[PDB]
RNA sequence: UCGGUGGUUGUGUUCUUCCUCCUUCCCUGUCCGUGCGUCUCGACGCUGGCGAUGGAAAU
RNA sequence: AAAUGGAUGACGCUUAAGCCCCAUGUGCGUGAUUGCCCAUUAUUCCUUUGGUGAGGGCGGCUAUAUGUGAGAAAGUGUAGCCCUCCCGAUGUAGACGUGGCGUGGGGGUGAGGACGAAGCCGAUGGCGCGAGCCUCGGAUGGACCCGCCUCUAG
């Protein structure tokens, strides 16, 4: 009630609704995709130059479920997200895999 | 396993002494959550019959008394509760359950919905299991029939908790949202 | 932490020992069988005496 | 000191079954040694309870010591009862607290407890020596427990971890303060 | 007990073992199924070669973190796989010297899962590829 | 909406034709309003884009003379100064919903004027949303499961009406025309649903005996 | 010279602390005043108020007055003042003092580059250049 | 744990615990070893991407 | 039963989202003893600062050129002689401390300046918890001025 706390986000995923399916996707890694407005630099920029574009990835680590209907929490390495990804895509990849 | 207020059998005497020695031992029973809140009711009613305080005292047994089965019986309940503008209040009630200690427990819950009064004012008498043919009220005597039956109507069937979509197709059951 | 408790207890590893031995299942068979026959042998001669 | 400790437990069952066996009842020795843990702050505390709370090297929330149960130290927890919670502690709660939490008062300072050979340094005693002669000294009681339980510094606890019922109100009320018996086992197994 | 100098000491997931089918999680052949050859010499990446025909993955290296781990396997007595080493990845069109180790050890390979009895379902099996599809699960799978 | 030369002259180009993005049919018919506002008010703040059709069905829970005299004291609040300044007594259906939904969002910031930018409640089903797709419900406040038997209920319609509202004719009227419509269609293409399910059968007995088993195992054969 | 690069550099503040309303007066400076106000709201520590500075801002005092290159500043203003920098090469660099003119700024930049003492205002070019 | 073996606590007019002393099976894991020529700070493995002197990358 | 339109905070809620009570992960009459959220609080880790602070090293012989390398002061206070460890840290009126900051002038000592002094300007950065110090650029200026130890005050 007294205000935010930027430095952890709150990502709600789809067919989870239990913290026991939440506890599976602890530890996976989670990028939010945008665009910028000109070509900036890029991982394989000169072995890959089909890779450049306005779009860019800012990662993150899921740390520990929230709650009880199976909210995470999720952890941007070492800065915050931008609020303007509130209410957006953010997308959760299968690895690091422990099965 | 479900009802709380588990039972209890209370022993206990006064601490021997010089011009009261092999003083008398006493026998309670009491519905308490934990042996604690029973030992508690003990000397609660020891220092208001005998004239017997914790201080002076000690506690012999605190065993957990065992029912016998798991069939359906008719418990007959006198209990008294206390209220200002009214004083005590006593009443004897009967109950359908399946042990001693759950019949209390429904007598405690509906002290507290019809009479508003919490587990502190209240004290139990007595709890016994009588027969059919013996049972003087008709939300209970109404069970007893052979052939007894009856549909279960305007039920609310909730999907388990794996399932619980939010958002469904109209005419299927093929989860949109969630 | 293992190294740490066995220095302040040296006997830690016969205790741990004896645990492991009481957790044994023919072990432990055995001694809830005969408990069994022990408390009812005394309950029916101390009730016949 | 395990020998001693499977000893006397036998002892006790045996002595409790022939009682039963026969129609009779057994009593138990009174207990001799409380755990005492404070559970409010620092903020508004009436002088009596404060001087008595200093007394018992209780200073701080969650501050936790032993205790021996003679009539002069029983009338004084029964003066900051809502302050306080306190039971009767186990051999697996003594062993916790030392282990994991005891640190020695040597020349003024708080040092934790890594070797018995520091154990054997602070107290210069010939019957304390090494953490299972603190243990035993704290459990059985002993004649040592005043220089055992001085030596050390007073134990500082996390808060529960499954939270805590009602700090206002008895426990006999369903709160948290007062005595619990042996129930205070269980609120200590989430603080230590 | 293995030391942590010798060659042969490894922690990987028991999952993980020759024969083993997997998944592929990341990279340019993500969603295609593989077979797990081998360890390299020390705690080192896997080496997956699927058959070229069947999956069209060649013989390359692979964290055993970026893939599943499936319970089907396939019995990899007959085989040899003692060619790959880490210097012929550590050279960094294809040479003629890696396309004839590449189709030597896949001759091996399909002769071997020929042999299983459900040889032509496997076939199958390793030409098909994982997606995520709207509105399933992996969490509730059991692979 | 409404593209301008610089739209159409931009797809001319590209090459584009037509483009409808990812949006959600609710069906309100039996819905209690509350429970069904406060569960698509957060959905719309999660980055949802939801249409809602037959605003008019919609329930309250009291006798029609309760909730009528309820919201005759909303209509008695007005700034006396400038009544053309004051609160705004919307009094369609459709209306209602969305200034129930408007309560539930923070709506003195962007990024909740967004969220209820994203919600469109029509009053039945009109012309444009027939034939997008399957419609949905929420089944926790579906007023089967909500309301006791016994008690008496509002239908926001009859409500609307007697307070303002004066196209309840209009409404009823292409409700009508549309059932028919829609039935005429549903009985024509009978055959080929047959035909289809005729299809699925016989199949089997065709295919491979392998594959039969399979299906046989799991229950769809 | 190389000098001796700490593994990691802190900072627990990069802001600086301005004076309460100094953005509201032309004429008031953005140096630091202590409050002295009985109902002022920086000196009470509202939540959403300026920060006064205290204690718990120092510095490490193992990387304190370290610069990002590595070295400590040592002020010079002539050729004498190079060699006390000779010995501890790898721990001070000097820097020319503003008021020394052009002439006298080549004969030290030239003393600096035969003896390898690190200079952070002479010319770049000659540091680029390896012997 | 079993079978014997005599001292012990306590009911009831014999048996009930606990001990010490042998006999059967069953379980687990024993011993030894490495101080520095006064003190302090410094030393950042493997794989890929980016960087080859440029209106360059990175912080 | 009262004087502007209007407040369980609002919407709303009636198989309550109301009143009185009872429970809890995965699996609620078969896992006995933590359903979950939020502090300048508690535990723990890192850094600063002050101590009625607690310990330790300080007699430099191991061997070594360039084309594994730097320090070490017997010490209140500094860029703290160095290394471990423990305990406190908010505060109006008020008291005290600081090899704490800054300004004009005297005695000493050491420099700078027409290859450009003071003054002035700044998306000039660096250092300091801070008062502040210093470099940079001027497509500004055109003759004086500063570091350190002490003394002094309009
Ligand atoms: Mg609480
Ligand atoms: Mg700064
Ligand atoms: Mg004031
Ligand atoms: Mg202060
Ligand atoms: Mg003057
Ligand atoms: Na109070
Ligand atoms: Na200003
Ligand atoms: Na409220």
């Given at each position: 009630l007294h205000g935010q706390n930027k430095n952890t986000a709150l990502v709600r995923i789809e067919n989870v609704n239990?913290?026991?399916?939440?506890?599976?996707?602890?530890?996976?890694?989670?990028?939010?995709?945008?665009?910028?407005?000109?070509?900036?630099?890029?991982?394989?920029?000169?072995?890959?130059?089909?890779?450049?574009?306005?779009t860019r990835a800012i990662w993150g680590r899921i740390t520990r479920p929230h709650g009880t209907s199976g909210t995470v929490r999720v952890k941007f390495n070492g800065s915050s997200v931008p609020a303007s990804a509130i209410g957006r895509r953010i997308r959760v990849y299968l690895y690091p895999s422990r099965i | 396993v479900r009802p709380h207020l588990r039972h209890y059998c209370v022993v206990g005497r006064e601490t021997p002494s010089e011009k009261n020695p092999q003083p008398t031992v006493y026998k309670f029973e009491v519905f308490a959550p934990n042996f604690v809140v029973a030992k508690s009711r003990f000397w609660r009613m020891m220092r208001e019959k005998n004239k017997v305080k914790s201080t002076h005292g000690d506690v012999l047994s605190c065993k957990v008394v065992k029912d016998r089965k798991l069939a359906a019986r008719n418990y007959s309940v006198d209990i008294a509760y206390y209220s200002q503008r009214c004083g005590y209040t006593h009443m004897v009630k009967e109950?359908?359950?399946?042990?001693?200690?759950?019949?209390?427990?429904?007598?405690?819950?509906?002290?507290?919905?019809?009479?508003?009064?919490?587990?502190?004012?209240?004290?139990?008498?007595?709890?016994?299991?009588?027969?059919?043919?013996?049972?003087?009220?008709?939300?209970?005597?109404?069970?007893?029939?052979?052939?007894?039956?009856?549909?279960?109507?305007?039920?609310?069937?909730?999907?388990?908790?794996?399932?619980?979509?939010?958002?469904?197709?109209?005419?299927?059951?093929?989860?949109?949202?969630? | 932490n293992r190294r740490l408790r066995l220095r302040l207890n040296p006997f830690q590893k016969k205790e741990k020992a004896m645990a492991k031995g009481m957790q044994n299942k023919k072990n432990r068979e055995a001694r809830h069988a005969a408990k069994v026959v022990r408390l009812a042998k005394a309950r029916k001669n101390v009730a016949k005496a | 000191?395990?020998?001693?400790?499977?000893?006397?437990?036998?002892?006790?069952?045996?002595?409790?079954?022939?009682?039963?066996?026969?129609?009779?009842?057994?009593?138990?020795?009174?207990?001799?040694?409380?755990?005492?843990?404070?559970?409010?702050?620092?903020?508004?505390?009436?002088?009596?309870?404060?001087?008595?709370?200093?007394?018992?090297?209780?200073?701080?929330?969650?501050?936790?010591?032993?205790?021996?149960?003679?009539?002069?130290?029983?009338?004084?927890?029964?003066?900051?009862?809502?302050?306080?919670?306190?039971?009767?502690?186990?051999?697996?709660?003594?062993?916790?607290?030392?282990?994991?939490?005891?640190?020695?008062?040597?020349?003024?300072?708080?040092?934790?407890?890594?070797?018995?050979?520091?154990?054997?340094?602070?107290?210069?005693?010939?019957?304390?020596?090494?953490?299972?002669d603190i243990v035993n000294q704290i459990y059985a009681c002993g004649k040592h427990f005043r220089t055992v339980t001085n030596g050390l510094w007073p134990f500082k606890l996390a808060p529960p971890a499954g939270g805590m019922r009602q700090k206002r109100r008895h426990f006999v009320e369903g709160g948290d303060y007062g005595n619990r018996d042996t129930l205070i086992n269980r609120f200590l197994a989430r603080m230590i | 007990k293995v030391s942590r100098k010798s060659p042969e000491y490894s922690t990987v997931r028991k999952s993980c073992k020759p024969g083993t089918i997997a998944i592929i999680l990341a990279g340019r052949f993500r969603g295609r199924r593989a077979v797990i050859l081998k360890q390299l010499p020390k705690n080192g990446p896997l080496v997956i070669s699927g058959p070229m025909k069947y999956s069209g993955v060649p013989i390359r290296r692979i964290d055993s973190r970026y893939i599943i781990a499936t319970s089907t396997r396939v019995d990899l007595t007959g085989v040899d796989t003692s060619a790959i080493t880490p210097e012929i990845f550590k050279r960094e069109t294809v040479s003629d010297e890696r396309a004839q180790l590449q189709n030597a050890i896949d001759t091996a390979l399909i002769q071997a899962i020929?042999?299983?009895?459900?040889?032509?379902?496997?076939?199958?099996?390793?030409?098909?590829?994982?997606?995520?599809?709207?509105?399933?699960?992996?969490?509730?799978?059991?692979w | 909406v409404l593209p301008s030369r610089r739209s159409l002259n931009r797809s001319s180009r590209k090459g584009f034709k037509k483009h409808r993005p990812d949006i959600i049919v609710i069906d309100l018919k039996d819905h209690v309003l509350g429970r069904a506002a406060a569960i698509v008010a957060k959905q719309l703040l999660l980055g949802k884009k939801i249409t809602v059709v037959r605003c008019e069905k919609l329930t309250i829970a009291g006798s029609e003379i309760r909730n009528k005299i309820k919201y005759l004291q909303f209509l008695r609040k007005r700034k006396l100064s400038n009544p053309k300044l004051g609160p705004f007594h919307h009094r369609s259906p459709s209306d209602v919903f969305i200034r129930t939904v408007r309560s539930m969002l923070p709506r003195y910031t962007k990024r909740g004027q967004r969220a209820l930018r994203q919600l469109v409640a029509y009053e039945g089903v009109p012309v444009n949303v027939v034939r997008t797709g399957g419609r949905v419900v929420i089944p926790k406040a579906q007023r089967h499961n909500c309301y006791r038997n016994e008690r008496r209920f509002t239908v926001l319609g009859n409500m609307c009406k007697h307070v303002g509202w004066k196209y309840s004719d209009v409404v009823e009227k292409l409700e009508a025309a549309r059932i028919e419509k829609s039935g005429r269609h549903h009985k024509k293409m009978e055959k080929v649903r047959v035909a289809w399910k005729n299809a699925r059968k016989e199949a089997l007995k065709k295919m491979p005996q392998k594959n039969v088993e399979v299906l046989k195992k799991f229950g769809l054969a | 010279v190389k000098p001796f690069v700490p593994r990691n550099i802190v900072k627990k503040r990069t802001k600086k602390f301005t004076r309460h309303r100094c953005e509201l007066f032309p004429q008031l400076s953005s140096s630091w005043r202590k409050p002295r106000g009985e109902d002022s709201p920086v000196r009470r520590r509202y939540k959403g108020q300026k920060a006064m500075p205290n204690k718990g801002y120092g510095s490490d005092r193992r990387t304190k007055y370290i610069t990002p290159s590595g070295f400590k500043n040592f002020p010079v203003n002539n050729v004498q003042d190079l060699y006390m920098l000779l010995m501890q090469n790898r721990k001070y660099a000097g820097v020319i003092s503003h008021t020394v003119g052009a002439k006298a700024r080549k004969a030290i930049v030239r003393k600096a580059h035969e003896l390898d003492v690190r200079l952070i205002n002479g010319n770049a070019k000659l540091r680029r250049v390896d012997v």
């Open positions: 239990t913290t026991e399916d939440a506890k599976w996707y602890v530890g996976k890694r989670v990028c939010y995709v945008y665009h910028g407005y000109k070509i900036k630099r890029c991982v394989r920029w000169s072995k890959a130059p089909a890779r450049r574009s306005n | 109950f359908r359950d399946v042990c001693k200690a759950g019949a209390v427990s429904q007598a405690y819950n509906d002290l507290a919905s019809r009479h508003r009064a919490r587990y502190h004012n209240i004290e139990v008498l007595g709890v016994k299991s009588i027969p059919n043919h013996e049972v003087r009220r008709l939300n209970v005597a109404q069970f007893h029939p052979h052939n007894l039956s009856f549909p279960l109507l305007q039920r609310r069937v909730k999907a388990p908790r794996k399932d619980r979509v939010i958002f469904v197709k109209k005419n299927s059951k093929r989860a949109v949202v969630a | - | 000191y395990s020998r001693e400790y499977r000893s006397t437990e036998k002892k006790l069952a045996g002595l409790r079954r022939n009682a039963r066996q026969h129609g009779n009842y057994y009593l138990e020795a009174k207990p001799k040694v409380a755990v005492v843990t404070r559970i409010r702050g620092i903020a508004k505390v009436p002088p009596k309870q404060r001087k008595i709370l200093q007394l018992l090297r209780l200073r701080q929330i969650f501050n936790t010591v032993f205790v021996r149960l003679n009539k002069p130290m029983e009338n004084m927890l029964r003066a900051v009862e809502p302050y306080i919670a306190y039971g009767y502690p186990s051999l697996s709660t003594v062993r916790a607290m030392v282990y994991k939490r005891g640190h020695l008062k040597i020349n003024g300072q708080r040092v934790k407890i890594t070797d018995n050979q520091m154990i054997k340094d602070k107290y210069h005693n010939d019957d304390i020596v090494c953490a299972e | 020929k042999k299983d009895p459900l040889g032509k379902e496997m076939a199958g099996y390793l030409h098909s590829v994982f997606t995520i599809k709207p509105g399933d699960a992996p969490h509730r799978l059991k | - | -």
